[PDB]
Curated annotation (Swiss-Prot):
Name the UniProt record assigns to this protein: Sensor protein QseC
Inducers of expression: By the signal autoinducer AI-2, through MqsR.
Protein species of origin: Escherichia coli (strain K12)
Topological domain ranges for the Cytoplasmic compartment: 3-13
Location in the cell: Cell inner membrane
Amino acid sequence: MGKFTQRLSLRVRLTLIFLILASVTWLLSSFVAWKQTTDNWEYREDMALAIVAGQLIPWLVALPIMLIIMMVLLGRE
């Protein structure tokens, strides 16, 4: 497998998607754990308009990342 040899943001395909997918899942978990309060099994914790934003933030950024991951293989995203 490659990616590590190239280490230029992105280059390979299929592997990077899985890697990022796992990274996103882990990130989401870390985010869920990263609870905020004051100043500036579980699954669905009682919250008004925060959990959605927390989940959305990484999603909005991850979405393009995935596209870029796949696009990089073509030549450029």
